[PDB]
């Protein structure tokens, strides 16, 4: 019976931690620091000294309504690093492969969190938000990889989820979702235009 507003959290964090003027390095640093503090406070050290053992959060552990933030912050860090590499690669063509490597892995965390959301412990509001976030990330990855057929469908699914949520909620609460869909609308138009 625990709810989470991933879009509200990320919107509040980006505009406060350097992305108001568009500085992704500070945002990536903030994401790393926040994940470090979250793990230190929640006592979720993946590895001890001189040993590392990667462990995934199971269905029972999410009772604190905070372990999802770990996956969210990992996805945010990967996406921010990829976005910074996007602007950096205009001079060095080599950075495109690194950007693709980061983007192909951010969707992994997105899909893992959307699968973790399947449990009955969480409410039905976070599931659709996780699905929309995963669709958004997948569409951006496939748009960067010059794949239009899958990107347009992912964008349409994400827009359908966002429009349904905005219609369900009141006008004041739906301004964030309206801005979110209007941000991705030009990407949808360009994806539809690339085929010609």
């Amino acid at each position: 019976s625990l709810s989470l507003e991933i879009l509200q959290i990320i919107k509040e964090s980006q505009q406060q931690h350097g992305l108001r003027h568009g500085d992704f390095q500070r945002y990536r640093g903030y994401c790393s620091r926040r994940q470090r503090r979250l793990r230190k406070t929640l006592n979720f050290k993946m590895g001890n000294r001189h040993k590392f053992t990667g462990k995934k959060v199971t269905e029972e552990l999410l009772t604190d309504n905070r372990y999802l933030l770990l996956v969210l912050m990992d996805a945010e860090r990967a996406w921010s690093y990829a976005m910074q590499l996007k602007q950096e690669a205009n001079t060095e063509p080599r950075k495109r492969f690194h950007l693709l490597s980061r983007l192909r892995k951010a969707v992994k965390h997105a899909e893992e969190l959307e699968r973790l959301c399947e449990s009955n412990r969480v409410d039905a509001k976070t599931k659709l938000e996780a699905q929309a976030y995963t669709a958004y990330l997948s569409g951006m990855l496939r748009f960067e990889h010059q794949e239009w057929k899958a990107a347009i469908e992912a964008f349409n699914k994400c827009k359908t989820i966002y429009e349904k949520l905005a219609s369900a909620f009141t006008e004041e609460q739906a301004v964030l979702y309206n801005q979110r869909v209007e941000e991705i609308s030009p990407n949808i138009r360009y994806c539809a235009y690339n085929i010609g």
Binding site: K86, P186, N187, Y190
Partner: protein, 128 residues
């Protein structure tokens, strides 16, 4: 290209084909403010809030060419297109622009739509 305007230093728009794609409410006013006060000089910098904007100056006839594309990445053919359209304008419409008085500019009508569309088609074919 999704937005393109050719207006004089006197604040009068000569020709545009924005259409339903874009509305020129305040996309060029911010650029004017940046040029007058900030003195950008950053090689077509200062995307305003949602789409990248680039400009080119013509001190010989007191003219400015503005081209606006989406914030998505675009190829470098835009600057070549701007140079070509500016040179075509200077070659053909020289009679009106060379005159200092704005009465001739007001009286003259420019049917540049077809030529600009052909240039855009050439640029898109090169881009593809």
């Amino acid at each position: 290209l999704d937005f393109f305007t050719i207006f004089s230093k006197g604040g009068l728009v000569l020709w545009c084909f924005q259409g339903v794609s874009d509305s020129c409410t305040g996309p060029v006013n911010a650029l004017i403010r940046s040029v007058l006060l900030q003195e950008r000089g950053g090689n077509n910098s200062f995307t305003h809030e949602a789409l990248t904007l680039k400009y080119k100056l013509d001190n010989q006839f007191e003219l400015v060419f503005v081209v606006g594309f989406q914030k998505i990445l675009t190829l470098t053919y835009v600057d070549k297109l701007i140079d070509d359209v500016h040179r075509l304008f200077r070659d053909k419409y020289r009679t009106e622009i060379q005159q200092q008085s704005a009465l001739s500019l007001l009286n003259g009508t420019f049917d540049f739509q077809n030529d600009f569309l052909r240039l855009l088609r050439e640029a898109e074919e090169s881009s593809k």
